[PDB]
Design a protein around this ligand. Structure first.
Ligand SMILES: Cc1cc2nc3c(=O)[nH]c(=O)nc-3n(C[C@H](O)[C@H](O)[C@H](O)COP(=O)(O)O)c2cc1C
Ligand SMILES: Cc1cc2nc3c(=O)[nH]c(=O)nc-3n(C[C@H](O)[C@H](O)[C@H](O)COP(=O)(O)O)c2cc1C
Ligand SMILES: Cc1cc2nc3c(=O)[nH]c(=O)nc-3n(C[C@H](O)[C@H](O)[C@H](O)COP(=O)(O)O)c2cc1C
Ligand SMILES: Cc1cc2nc3c(=O)[nH]c(=O)nc-3n(C[C@H](O)[C@H](O)[C@H](O)COP(=O)(O)O)c2cc1C
Ligand SMILES: O=C(O)[C@@H](O)Cc1ccccc1
Ligand SMILES: O=C(O)[C@@H](O)Cc1ccccc1
Ligand SMILES: O=C(O)[C@@H](O)Cc1ccccc1
Ligand SMILES: O=C(O)[C@@H](O)Cc1ccccc1
Ligand SMILES: O=C(O)[C@@H](O)Cc1ccccc1
Ligand SMILES: O=C(O)[C@@H](O)Cc1ccccc1
Ligand SMILES: O=C(O)[C@@H](O)Cc1ccccc1
Ligand SMILES: O=C(O)[C@@H](O)Cc1ccccc1
Lengths: 331, 331, 331, 331
């Protein structure tokens, strides 16, 4: 595998069609899904030359911990859909690569088992039905050693995924929500979470500038600027198109991550140059999982690591901070 | 049917080619027809998160009455072309959905029969040959219980529809202008109508900002920002491209509606976010009529209702007014 | 024929390939040729409604004479290439339509014969080898009753037409330059012409704003904002893209015409709305000539006349002057 | 051959696939490779008319010497890959055309043999492993009569060329680095070179404005605004998109060249109009070499010479300086 696109074809071959579609699809006409890629493709970097590259490092510090790359594995529900080892395969590869892994509320292996793998697990929260259970999930995650709560804020309910509707797709009987035996979140829900954990709370799915500033005011330790991979509002702006304005508005008040369509180290560089602290990567991690299990994800993460270092140095950046100071031009 | 596009294919199968073309076509090279869709596709919404969605409502008040959605059925002449029950099937489904139905001057069932169906009928006016007959049609409509006069102002004569010319298309002998046994409108014609009814007069086919302001000055209760579905001037700007500027110029002085290419609840949301009070929908209603009669239109209107509610809540809007305060970004 | 595009197909059928290519082609990679159409397609008109259309007229006064449309037939060399009656067929149809016809320096029928047809002939000048012969051609034209000298200023030499090179195209022995038994023009050449005729001198092939202003200063009675149909500099900006800026810069000091890709009455309207006094039309006139001789050109000119009137009234313009006051929007 | 594109097809026929790919390819997804052409295609020139063209000259003075065209042959490593005579064939044709030829550090014929051909050789430098050897290469070049040192500054290491990886491409045993029996460059390396030669030092691969100004401050005699033909950072902005801003920032302090996708005399004109002193041309020279050896390159250079003169005069420019004062418009 010499690009992330080799892995997509290999995943399409092995997965059942309806599962491939569950993974690949977006909501509505898939406008936002396609726009995530379009938007990245319009961005060109203006590289710097003749800088010292004797110690190029891709490491960052985030939410109290060193990460090997400015990247984390995005939350993706039900990973046993893609491979029998599911979340454990992905979490092991992430641990070994030094990349944070986001454990899902709807994980197909329990959060405690996943966290036992080690590494830098984060925990993604879907707000439940009741405040007390939501907060129980948060406490479980914190007790298990998760280092951040990734509160998903863009899913008051799920988007209408027409591929799944047409396929009549439903979870196989062999995949379950292993954390169990839901409701719209509000700012009051954010406060309830913030009051009940000492972990950084990261709001995932912020697109409006006013919401980014309120997230800081609310005591968030980060946000993820995201349209949920084009799976929520069809017609929502891509995160990458809001990122620059949002980074300027928070003015260092929280970490600002982005996701949506990141498919190479050059894409990571683009996101960094627009001001992102780090990115999330979703679908490609699942392609590598589907294609080759743990070793598949490990290979993906090594290819991304090499592509990020490559891109940084070709752009004259010895550190991620320097990459953030690069300028861009739209094509 | 899980999108409006399923219905188009079903209509293409059942209708005779030349009738499908009458419906689908525009004037000239169809530039304005295509641009209506292009323009909507360029618009992205910036959704808001974490707002109270406990009582999301799609209702609006317009021209004195509650409507269930910010939408009305556009005037489309000769609906017996598409189904034997014609306008009565459409008007019944609209009534049952709580959406206003626009009765045409060139309806293939008489305006009085259509209005007898009940619901919230509006009446569209083509200016006749003489002031007295025009005003008779208006009086008939008002006497029959129509709640607004939709004066079409963009048809001093008809556009050159090359599909129809090539097809040598002509009304079958079995469809007639059931309101009977025409001339360019002017501002003087608007005043004659305004002076002779107590109903709100809505000017349909306004694109210039100066014309929107004059419509307010003239005592219009609304306008429809529209290029007549690309069927009049070929090269006329899409309404959606003028809407924001026109909403700012009238500064609350009349309702501002838009039409042209609205094909989903996400499109409704876009129009709302650009400042529209409500939209009209034309061709898709006729596709549903052609495909499945009354029940077909009912299904379409239920799908739109669900898509509008979906979109609103995913964008953090509990009401249409809140949707109007959303910001947009062009792609 | 219900569009100008029907005529192109009919011309492609009858003409020998290499002659069709001579007609259709441009210089280089044909970038400027294609851009003429692209540019027109980006322009949308903002129509006005509810104006008096009781006496819509397409007439204009130009260079001392009434014309039936804001349009003239562009100079196109060697029209016997396309039909045996060549320039006489075209000039007769133009006369009968009330449109000025531009007689070429390289006409395949003598300028005196063409002018004998009557109508409103103009004469296009290519600068010769010597000042005295150039001026003889001008005197011949004036003596024959031509009403304007269209001095071509964008051909210091001919563009590299790769279709013709590949075809090894050469004038058949049966077509000759009937005005005979060339050199780069300069501003000094313009003055020599201006000093030797009382006719309005029109500089054809102006694209820079500074050249438009100098043309006024030089005593030109008009200019044609033009990239020579994409046949001269490959990469020259389309005239339509310079027109607005040039109209503002001359501020009524001379007539400002445009050409390049005008293929409908809607295109005429666009050019007018951008500020053109009139347009030239080239290739479509030759398609109609090739397809059906005199009667073919007559049909084209009647179709354009109807399309121009149609477009004007749909846009609320009772006169060409009103069309010039329309606003536009780029798509 | 009547365009540069005829030569590409002829090269594709004769070269082995993997060598054609080595030549044609870029890094990553080839975004920057494609963008070099896109960017040129967006540029339109605004030509001037009616200027004196009695003595049109394409000559320029650069780095102390007259060149016949505002163009040089770009450095391209290992030219014996494309033809058995390699660099000598290219250098002979360049000499005979009066165009500077850039001898590569990785030339497949020794720099001394190439320079013995005569003409205006320049020498391109890749920074070595040690300062003393780098400087030896520079001294060799100067001793051999090279007239400028083209220091490549955009290759701290090589880009990831996926075509070559997929092809498993490797230098045949019959091609060697004939100058021998590498390390990231820095500004300190530039100074070491500048201190050790009296030749103008030209930094090739500058894209940021701040780097252009520092190059002047560093005592460079020129720069080449370049993304290395899309072979280094995938996502690097095209040089042509930075050129105008960089020319304004150096304000005459050094020569500013550009490369990337120059494929015609019209493209040369575009680069000149954006402010370039001269261009480099890479891939097309290798196509002509592959197709027809020395005589192939000679034919290419004659075709470019004629296309540059053609374009200049059609645009009203009697000299390259006048071409630099042309304005442009983006399409
Ligand atoms: C199959 C699938 C399941 C997902 N499940 C979740 C989830 O449970 N929670 C969440 O916050 N995001 C979820 N996401 C969204 C991802 O976290 C991420 O925002 C999106 O996939 C990012 O884009 P990418 O896949 O283009 O890299 C899911 C995405 C996919 C494709
Ligand atoms: C077949 C057909 C007939 C129409 N008849 C009328 C009419 O009688 N009066 C009118 O004002 N608009 C008429 N319209 C225009 C519609 O009211 C509406 O402006 C246009 O169709 C809106 O766009 P949409 O079809 O893209 O939703 C007609 C449209 C179509 C397609
Ligand atoms: C076959 C052909 C021959 C032409 N000959 C001349 C000429 O002799 N003089 C001139 O000024 N323009 C000449 N032109 C350019 C036209 O006058 C006009 O600028 C160009 O064709 C306008 O565009 P259109 O063909 O797109 O309508 C010629 C154009 C064509 C296609
Ligand atoms: C096969 C190949 C080899 C190259 N080798 C070198 C090199 O040794 N040094 C260098 O500075 N640039 C090198 N370049 C880049 C060229 O100098 C030039 O920047 C690029 O090819 C310019 O674009 P063009 O090929 O689009 O005209 C090479 C380019 C190609 C295609
Ligand atoms: O995009 C998302 O967040 C959802 O698709 C995750 C999910 C999948 C399946 C069932 C429930 C939830
Ligand atoms: O308005 C801005 O500043 C960004 O939306 C521009 C942008 C477009 C596409 C991708 C990234 C950024
Ligand atoms: O777009 C419109 O408004 C017309 O097509 C309506 C109409 C149809 C048929 C006959 C007359 C009128
Ligand atoms: O000028 C403006 O402000 C709008 O025309 C922009 C727009 C384009 C496309 C769609 C909607 C809006
Ligand atoms: O575009 C033009 O103006 C030329 O093609 C006219 C011409 C044709 C043939 C020979 C000479 C001149
Ligand atoms: O800069 C301007 O104002 C015109 O070039 C814009 C334009 C583009 C395309 C067509 C016409 C006009
Ligand atoms: O683009 C470049 O500069 C390299 O491809 C040149 C090179 C080719 C082969 C081996 C080493 C270096
Ligand atoms: O910003 C500018 O001024 C140039 O990037 C514009 C440009 C685009 C494409 C080609 C050349 C120039």
């Amino acid at each position: 595998y010499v690009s992330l696109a080799d892995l997509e074809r290999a995943a399409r071959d092995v997965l059942p069609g309806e599962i491939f579609d569950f993974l690949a699809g977006g909501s509505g006409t898939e406008a936002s899904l396609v726009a995530n890629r379009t938007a990245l493709e319009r961005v060109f970097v203006i590289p710097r030359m003749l800088r010292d590259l004797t110690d190029v490092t891709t490491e960052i510090d985030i939410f109290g911990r060193r990460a090997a790359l400015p990247m984390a594995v995005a939350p993706v529900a039900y990973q046993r859909l893609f491979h029998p080892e599911g979340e454990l395969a992905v979490a092991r590869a992430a641990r070994d690569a030094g990349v944070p892994y986001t454990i899902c509320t709807l994980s197909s292996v329990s959060l405690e088992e996943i966290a036992a793998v080690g590494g830098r697990p984060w925990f993604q929260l879907f707000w439940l039905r009741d405040e007390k259970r939501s907060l129980d999930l948060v406490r479980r995650a914190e007790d298990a050693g998760c280092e951040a709560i990734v509160f998903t804020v863009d899913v008051p309910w799920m988007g209408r995924r027409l591929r799944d509707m047409r396929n009549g797709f439903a979870l196989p009987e062999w995949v379950t929500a292993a954390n169990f035996d839901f409701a719209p979140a509000t700012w009051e829900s954010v406060e309830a979470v913030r009051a009940h954990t000492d972990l950084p709370v990261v709001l995932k799915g912020i697109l409006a500038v006013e919401d980014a500033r309120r997230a800081v005011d609310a005591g968030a330790g980060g946000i993820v600027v995201s349209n949920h991979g084009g799976r929520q509002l069809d017609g929502a702006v891509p995160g990458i198109e809001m990122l620059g304005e949002i980074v300027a508005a928070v003015s260092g008040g929280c970490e600002v991550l982005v996701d949506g369509g990141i498919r190479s180290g050059g894409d990571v560089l683009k996101a960094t140059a627009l001001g992102a602290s780090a990115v999330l990567v979703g679908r490609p991690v699942m392609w590598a999982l589907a294609a080759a299990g743990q070793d598949g994800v490990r290979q993906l993460l090594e290819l991304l690591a090499e592509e990020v270092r490559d891109a940084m140095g070709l752009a004259g950046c010895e550190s991620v901070g320097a990459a953030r100071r690069l300028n861009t031009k739209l094509g």
